[PDB]
Symmetry: C2
Subunit: 557 residues, 2 copies
């Protein structure tokens, strides 16, 4: 395993064993008035500023140096170029990894298998735009000649969560667009409850599946199609209400979709990195293609920042190494993502997939079994909702939890002359200040005394009122949450995931872990029909199946 054998890594772990515990944020800030200046990064995109304040982290100049050294010695710069240049770094599948090509606004040639991929990227985008124009303007008409009012994306994983998170994040930019709906669960209630709110004559479905045989997606697509046909009787109308983001033209034709409404993407486009491709169609439809282009440009901006910036000043890499520090040295299992922004309520869920499906790995690019930790469990809820659910554990539990706090300076809803947003900002700043400052015994004792508590009352309360602090955070503040900024932000985290992967020597771009579950589920499916008991598995699987058969018959109240 490369990491463990890397001398810079070893130096890093030895230092932590020796000095890690003695680091205390409060002392560090009390002793060094330049801390913010030393550990902060200001990015002017020319379309708004993004401030990355990583100063409330358990680091010193010495630690940052050791980390930057490790990134250098782990080759992140060369691995980065390999990615951007089209080399097949997805080693286990022998594929390129070029989500950066999807948003490549410079159109600089990126060649794979002898051909510049750019023209294909652009043909698809041009195609998406033309269609998006037809639909939004009311040009495109349903089978009864009515304009489209609802766009329904059907897909799983990356064919879903991205468009869904982005459209929710960019709501304010959706004037003139039709409503978007997202179906993903195979669970029939997901499609039932969506279908119940629709009019077939004005609904347009998008089936998002590269192979067009994804089971849950195609099953959902077929239910939608039978629902449509109940009204339209006529199968030739399907072409008016169902389009496809896919590569499987035969299967697409078979379903009833006009193959001119098949929007292609490529194998170098991982699902958890697909929103910038044809997979983004529902985003473009909801907020228009200008905004979709701003989203891509935002991503492109961050891509250039990742590429041209010295490591010391590289947002994505600084983010990654801080994570390595907490994962491979402090041993923290999780990474919290807390955007103080309701529109961004699925931001954390989205990266739960991006990070976890990319870096939840245990085999290195050499075939070696990892002997160090890899990807963290990512999780979160937007502030201040989360603040009211679980921060108690963050402030006073027994776990170290690195948190990323995010917020826009300008809100899309400056209601009450800025009141809600002021309170929101104050909490965003106070929470991180709290996590790092804490409240000592003496500090709490004073408050108890001043509040009128008795000595007995004081004695019992005291310990519970102490905050140990020393809980590290990142603050990421940006001028406003526009399509462009959102683009840069998503890409920033994408590149953070890339770097950690490189440092760990794993392949962030495959996902072999899904195979076992699918094959086992195929075996079970037919065993579920019928009354007789199943005895072919382990006793649990067997017992569970038999309990389902017994109770499926039950009439309950």
């Amino acid at each position: 395993a490369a990491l463990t054998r890397n001398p810079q890594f070893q130096k890093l772990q030895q230092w932590h064993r020796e000095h890690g515990s003695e680091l205390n944020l409060r002392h560090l800030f009390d002793t060094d008035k330049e801390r913010f200046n030393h550990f902060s990064l200001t990015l002017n995109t020319n379309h708004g500023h993004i401030l990355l304040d990583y100063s409330k982290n358990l680091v010193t100049e010495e630690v940052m140096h050791m980390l930057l050294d490790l990134a250098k010695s782990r080759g992140v710069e060369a691995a980065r170029e390999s990615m951007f240049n089209g080399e097949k770094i997805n080693s286990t599948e022998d594929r390129a990894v070029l989500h950066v090509a999807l948003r490549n606004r410079s159109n600089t040639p990126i060649v794979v298998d002898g051909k510049d991929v750019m023209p294909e990227v652009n043909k698809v985008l041009d195609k998406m735009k033309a269609f998006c124009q037809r639909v939004r303007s009311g040009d495109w008409k349903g089978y009864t000649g009515k304009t489209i009012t609802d766009v329904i994306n059907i897909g799983i994983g990356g064919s879903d969560l991205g468009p869904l998170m982005v459209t929710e994040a960019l709501k304010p930019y959706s004037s003139g667009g039709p409503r978007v709906w997202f179906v993903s669960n195979i669970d029939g209630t997901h499609i039932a409850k969506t279908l119940a709110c629709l009019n077939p004559e004005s609904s347009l479905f998008i089936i998002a599946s590269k192979t067009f045989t994804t089971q849950e997606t195609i099953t959902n697509a077929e239910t939608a199609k039978d629902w449509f046909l109940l009204s339209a009787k006529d199968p030739s109308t399907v072409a008016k209400h169902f389009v496809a983001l896919s590569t499987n033209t035969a299967k697409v034709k078979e379903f009833g979709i006009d193959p001119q409404n098949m929007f292609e993407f490529w194998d170098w486009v991982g699902g958890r990195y697909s929103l910038w491709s044809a997979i983004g169609l529902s985003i473009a439809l909801h907020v228009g293609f200008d905004n979709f282009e701003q989203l891509l440009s935002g991503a492109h901006w961050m891509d250039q920042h990742f590429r041209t910036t010295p490591l010391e000043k590289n947002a994505p890499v600084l983010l990654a190494m801080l994570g390595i520090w907490y994962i491979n040295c402090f041993g923290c299992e999780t990474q919290a993502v807390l955007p103080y922004d309701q529109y961004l309520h699925r931001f954390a869920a989205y990266f739960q997939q991006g990070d976890m499906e990319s870096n939840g790995k245990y085999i290195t690019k050499s075939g070696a079994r990892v002997d160090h930790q890899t990807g963290p469990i990512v999780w979160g809820e937007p502030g201040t909702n989360g603040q009211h659910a679980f921060y108690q554990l963050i402030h006073q539990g027994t776990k170290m939890i690195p948190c990323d706090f995010l917020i826009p300076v300008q809100t899309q809803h400056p209601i009450r002359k800025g009141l809600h947003h002021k309170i929101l900002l104050a909490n965003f700043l106070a929470q991180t200040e709290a996590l790092m400052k804490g409240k000592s015994t003496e500090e709490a004792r004073k408050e108890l005394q001043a509040a009128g508590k008795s000595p007995e009352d004081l004695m019992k309360l005291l310990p519970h009122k102490v905050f140990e602090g020393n809980r590290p955070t990142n603050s990421i503040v940006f001028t406003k949450l526009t399509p462009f900024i959102l683009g840069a932000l998503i890409a920033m985290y994408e590149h953070k995931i890339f770097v950690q992967g490189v440092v760990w020597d794993i392949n962030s771009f495959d996902q072999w872990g899904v195979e076992l579950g699918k094959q086992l589920a195929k075996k079970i499916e037919p065993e579920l029909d019928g009354s007789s008991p199943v005895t072919s598995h382990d006793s649990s699987t067997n017992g569970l199946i038999n309990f389902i058969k017994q109770q499926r018959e039950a009439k309950i109240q």
Copy 2:
């Protein structure tokens, strides 16, 4: 710190040290065909069955005995009676913990400070029912004589999540009820994107707040009022469109709400255990009082189960000790909740609050600082959604992650002759089968060889195809997700949480962790006013503040 002093605890740890790594799920099942029979539990509620199958846990009859011995030596049973008897077990706040009184259908007296609380519980319930009748039937009217179509719940933490989660879960039981909406974030987009969807004439607001001075709630309540008065205009109209869940009669009247529509609850009702009280007004409004009464009955049934069942077969206890095993011996930081049910999409989020805010503690009932792990990090998304997001890390990452898998046998939407649910069940059973069974190097090799891979190609891919398995899960299956079953399930986890807290000797029922953040936010609020640079905090807090002040006036192009 007594858990650590406890001899049963010590023996458990010493045993795990010597034998824990030896446990192999696949081997246990292979060597004991009764495993399922021996490590599972069936519960007939008279309103649906609940199968708790904990056989896929790293545990033997010896380990369980040790875990129960521990629950015994830690006084689980007595603490339990203490809660049920109305004793002040919330020791820091000197209060009773009586959410079980709220659902006490037997009406057995529970006396606090010399008086049965039941009559007060039932008075409020009766009152909840009457108003609910008045609203659903159309009797209750708005300032223009229209009946109510939308009910808007406004609150934070427990005044919001429970009601949001339960109404999402029980949607099919809402025929005849008004649409419910939930507003919690202080961030302005929340209330604003909600208000934009309403008609003031037929909208009823419910401001949920014990003290009625909860800053973010009240701020939202005022924005709502002010928005209602922009059309209704007469302040006396507020009383027909706002009711309150509170005890602060004065603050309620001062807001314009009629004190006769102030539904009360008590000190002994924790926010994270409040949905069963007046706090569930919106639940009752949405699904009717009958269903709401079914919900409390389900929880009462589980309460009785917890109270009368010997530890060995006590579901919540079993759940509690199992978690102790993973938390205190295996060192697992997190616990996943994965409902294969889209209606339950907010179930995990609910328990993230109910668990982490109860048990994220570090000071024990005696004042000592713990020296062992405490509450886990709770997270999740419903399957198969989550399956397609992060299961990669669970199957092949570097972290042990206890998962609870839950599913109703019978679905609320049996479309396509049951095809969707069939697939859902198959994935539900297959995933746990997979986490347990894994796929070995040899098995993976035969596959690759069978797929015609060259020796070089096989070699490079082989280890990536290996599933190590041995990943423990609980499988909780229940006949159907009805209001009753749901209530049972909620109470089940409530008691799991209670049992863990007792073992940790912490106070699951206070929440002192919120103060610092609250204190520090109020300091910052006024400082945000203006263009003067702030200098009064550590350099990061100042830096952030100044950047915010600097960018609030940035025109963005």
